Amino acid sequence: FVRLGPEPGWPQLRLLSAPSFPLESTLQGPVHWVRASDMRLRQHVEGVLERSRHILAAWEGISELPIPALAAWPPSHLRWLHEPLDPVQDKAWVQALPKVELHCHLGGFATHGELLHKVRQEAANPESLPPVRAIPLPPGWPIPEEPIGLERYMRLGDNNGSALLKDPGCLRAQCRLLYEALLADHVAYAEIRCSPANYASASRSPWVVLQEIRNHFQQAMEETPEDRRCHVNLLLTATREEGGDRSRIARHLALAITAAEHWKNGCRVVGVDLAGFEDRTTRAAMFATDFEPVHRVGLAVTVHAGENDDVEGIWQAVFKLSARRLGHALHLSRSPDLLRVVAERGIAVELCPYANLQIKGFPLDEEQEGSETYPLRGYLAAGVAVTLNTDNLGISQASLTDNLLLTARLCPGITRLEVLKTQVFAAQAAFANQAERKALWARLAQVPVPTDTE
Amino acid sequence: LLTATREEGGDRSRIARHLALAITAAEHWKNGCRVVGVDLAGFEDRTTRAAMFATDFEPVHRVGLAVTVHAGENDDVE
Amino acid sequence: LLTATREEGGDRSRIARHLALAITAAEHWKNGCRVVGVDLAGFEDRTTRAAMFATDFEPVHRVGLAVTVHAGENDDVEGIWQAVFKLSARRLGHALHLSRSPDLLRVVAERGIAVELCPYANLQIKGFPLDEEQEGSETYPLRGYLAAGVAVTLNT
Amino acid sequence: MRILLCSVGTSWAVVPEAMQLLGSQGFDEVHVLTTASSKISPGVEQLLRYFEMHPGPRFSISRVQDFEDLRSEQDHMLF
Ligand SMILES: [Zn+2]
Numbered sequence: 001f002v003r004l005g006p007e008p009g010w011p012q013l014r015l016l017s018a019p020s021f022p023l024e025s026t027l028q029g030p031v032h033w034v035r036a037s038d039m040r041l042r043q044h045v046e047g048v049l050e051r052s053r054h055i056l057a058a059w060e061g062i063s064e065l066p067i068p069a070l071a072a073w074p075p076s077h078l079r080w081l082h083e084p085l086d087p088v089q090d091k092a093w094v095q096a097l098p099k100v101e102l103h104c105h106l107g108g109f110a111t112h113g114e115l116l117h118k119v120r121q122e123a124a125n126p127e128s129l130p131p132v133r134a135i136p137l138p139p140g141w142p143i144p145e146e147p148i149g150l151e152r153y154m155r156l157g158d159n160n161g162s163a164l165l166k167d168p169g170c171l172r173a174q175c176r177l178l179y180e181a182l183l184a185d186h187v188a189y190a191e192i193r194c195s196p197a198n199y200a201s202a203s204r205s206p207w208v209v210l211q212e213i214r215n216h217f218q219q220a221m222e223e224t225p226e227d228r229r230c231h232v233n234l235l236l237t238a239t240r241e242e243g244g245d246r247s248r249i250a251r252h253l254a255l256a257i258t259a260a261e262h263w264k265n266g267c268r269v270v271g272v273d274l275a276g277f278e279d280r281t282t283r284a285a286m287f288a289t290d291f292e293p294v295h296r297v298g299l300a301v302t303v304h305a306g307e308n309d310d311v312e313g314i315w316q317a318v319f320k321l322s323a324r325r326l327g328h329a330l331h332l333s334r335s336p337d338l339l340r341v342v343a344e345r346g347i348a349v350e351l352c353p354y355a356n357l358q359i360k361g362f363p364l365d366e367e368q369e370g371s372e373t374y375p376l377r378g379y380l381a382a383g384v385a386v387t388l389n390t391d392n393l394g395i396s397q398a399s400l401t402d403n404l405l406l407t408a409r410l411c412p413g414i415t416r417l418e419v420l421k422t423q424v425f426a427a428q429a430a431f432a433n434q435a436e437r438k439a440l441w442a443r444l445a446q447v448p449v450p451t452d453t454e
Numbered sequence: 455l456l457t458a459t460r461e462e463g464g465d466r467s468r469i470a471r472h473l474a475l476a477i478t479a480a481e482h483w484k485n486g487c488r489v490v491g492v493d494l495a496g497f498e499d500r501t502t503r504a505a506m507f508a509t510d511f512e513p514v515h516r517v518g519l520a521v522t523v524h525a526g527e528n529d530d531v532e
Numbered sequence: 533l534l535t536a537t538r539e540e541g542g543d544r545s546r547i548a549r550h551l552a553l554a555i556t557a558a559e560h561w562k563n564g565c566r567v568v569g570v571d572l573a574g575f576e577d578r579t580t581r582a583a584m585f586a587t588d589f590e591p592v593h594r595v596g597l598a599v600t601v602h603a604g605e606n607d608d609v610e611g612i613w614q615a616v617f618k619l620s621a622r623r624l625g626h627a628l629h630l631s632r633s634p635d636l637l638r639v640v641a642e643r644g645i646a647v648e649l650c651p652y653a654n655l656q657i658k659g660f661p662l663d664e665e666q667e668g669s670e671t672y673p674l675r676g677y678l679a680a681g682v683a684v685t686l687n688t
Numbered sequence: 689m690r691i692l693l694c695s696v697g698t699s700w701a702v703v704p705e706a707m708q709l710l711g712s713q714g715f716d717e718v719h720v721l722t723t724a725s726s727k728i729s730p731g732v733e734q735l736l737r738y739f740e741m742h743p744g745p746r747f748s749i750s751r752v753q754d755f756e757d758l759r760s761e762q763d764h765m766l767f
Contacts, residue, residue: 025750030736031751032748032749032750033753034752034753035752035753035754200481202484205478205481205482206478206481207479207481207482246516247517250477250516250517251481251517254517255474257475258471258474258475258478289509290512290513292466292470292510292617293466293470293474293510293513295613296465296466296467296469296470296613296635297467297470297471298635298636298639315593315594319620322616322620324642337596341593344622345622346644463608463610464608465609465610465635466610466613467635501578
């Protein structure tokens with residue numbers, strides 16, 4: 001007897017059982033006659049060994065993969081990730097990516113086109129519908145020849161928002177249609193920003209509007225299967241301006257505090273969004289005492305500190321408002337000390353490629369990078385947690401898929417791993433709880449398999 | 455009236471919840487029983503002489519909610 | 533870490549020297565041993581409680597110096613609240629009463645603010661029970677903090 | 689429990705010899721896999737007679753259907 005030694009087997013192969021792969025047997029006398037119905041077991045075994053080789057090959061270097069499930073990818077597929085993103089060839093791969101949406105405005109979704117009419121045709125009171133104003137889009141939209149600035153950008157969404165969403169029927173259509181846009185884009189987690197007091201009426205309090213918005217999204221979420229369901233959380237936008245009426249901020253801040261404990265499950269209010277008029281008169285510290293109640297009840301804060309080309313406003317947002325996320329904020333590099341603080345404290349930067357290109361303008365399709373480029377890759381290289389968003393699905397006329405692909409043209413040489421790293425950043429930056437984060441991470445583990453690699 | 459209770463160096467989160475609840479409820483109900491103001495009550499001392507609650511109550515003043523204040527167990531006119 | 537100690541009596545000249553020393557040394561050394569933050573050391577009470585030094589620590593935040601707040605011999609959550617938001621503290625020392633404020637505990641975990649626990653010192657100063665059977669109303673809050681998602685560190 | 693799996697060919701005597709690896713204690717049950725070849729059919733009965741006169745462990749002489757001879761790659765994958 002020559003013994004070749006015990007064999008431990010393979011960890012996921014020694015658990016297989018006979019019922020899973022039955023062997024049909026015909027009894028001829030005292031001797032069994034066995035046959036195999038198909039080749040399923042070998043296909044299972046070889047698929048396991050195929051995956052086991054991938055994990056061991058990618059085992060050394062797993063810390064550099066934002067999604068650990070990517071270690072089961074073939075080494076050719078992993079080399080594909082490190083290659084620069086192709087805006088025209090990776091349209092299908094980006095479209096199928098489970099995405100995270102952190103900066104999306106409810107009032108800027110169905111601003112023009114067929115979607116504007118679909119919201120209008122479901123008004124509860126068609127006689128109260130405002131006339132459709134003539135708002136012509138700049139030529140080349142969504143990629144204008146020249147940047148249009150912030151004033152012209154907000155005027156492109158004048159057919160929707162407060163004008164249209166005071167109607168309960170229009171508000172319902174806007175919420176359900178926006179969710180349908182999220183599902184079509186394979187968004188797994190979204191945070192929608194709304195201004196419920198802007199849509200309030202004499203008989204409809206801002207609490208009534210917000211409760212309708214939440215239940216419209218909750219009903220949409222419940223009707224969707226768990227596998228492809230987009231979890232929607234709500235941020236309340238506190239809008240600042242030059243005097244006029246700042247009791248609306250107190251109403252929105254109080255509404256978000258009230259809504260925070262009201263809904264502990266499903267769609268829920270998870271933060272406030274300080275936004276509106278950007279100036280040294282309306283800089284962050286002016287509202288520092290308004291947000292003390294927000295901080296006492298554990299509500300997160302994100303700040304629209306991204307147009308006036310200031311860095312002092314970002315300083316108050318980080319340190320006077322305790323903002324967890326910064327909207328836009330394309331001029332962090334102006335203060336290399338503030339850039340270090342943003343990366344060190346984990347403050348996430350919400351980048352909106354199309355909106356930034358349309359409002360500010362950035363060099364496009366340049367083969368080198370310098371002094372004017374979109375700061376996405378510079379922010380990533382500095383350790384900033386960067387997320388990519390749509391800002392306004394309607395005004396910008398682009399989905400989250402289009403915004404991700406535009407970063408290929410905005411930032412030369414951005415890799416497909418870096419796109420995946422922004423989705424991971426957005427999951428970490430989300431104002432989600434443990435149950436929402438766990439559900440979102442299970443979705444992000446399902447990265448689409450690339451086609452036509454090498 | 456919703457009572458915002460002063461507590462000695464303690465959680466102002468319950469005050470924030472009560473003050474925000476009143477602002478939300480003040481405009482929710484326009485008829486019948488309705489929330490019409492806030493009460494500042496609870497602990498009272500030289501620390502809580504209610505000057506430093508003025509930041510908490512500016513949002514209450516912005517939405518036209520009336521305020522009544524408890525002069526508690528004390529002999530202070532300040 | 534340079535320690536700025538709060539003192540009974542309002543003496544803030546040595547705090548001004550320590551805070552200015554850390555700012556000067558922050559960019560002086562960029563390799564090897566370097567000054568990386570300031571610690572706001574221990575005198576308790578509403579006087580010398582965090583937010584009173586928010587003006588003092590504006591220069592520290594502007595030069596990218598991290599802040600840890602060193603709570604000691606106190607049982608108030610307002611100091612932790614002011615350390616997190618008025619002081620922008622990135623770490624908390626001896627924060628043994630976070631569970632008493634459920635909102636504060638969630639904020640600490642959500643913002644990734646670490647809690648520096650010192651097992652022996654906390655036992656010697658506060659006196660937690662030892663070798664007890666399961667749990668309850670007296671146990672060291674280390675395992676309670678971990679279950680809440682709090683970044684917990686153990687120190688000497 | 690101790691189960692012995694033994695493939696067999698034109699050399700049926702390997703299975704009874706494989707029975708003696710553990711000594712007098714033997715195996716709690718032994719199972720034999722066989723191909724459908726007619727050349728090795730006589731060895732199947734020789735295994736049966738040995739099993740009858742040495743009983744006590746469970747016996748199986750399960751024969752792989754539609755596998756007569758190893759001709760191409762498909763035969764081995766079927767086995
Ligand atoms: Zn925006």
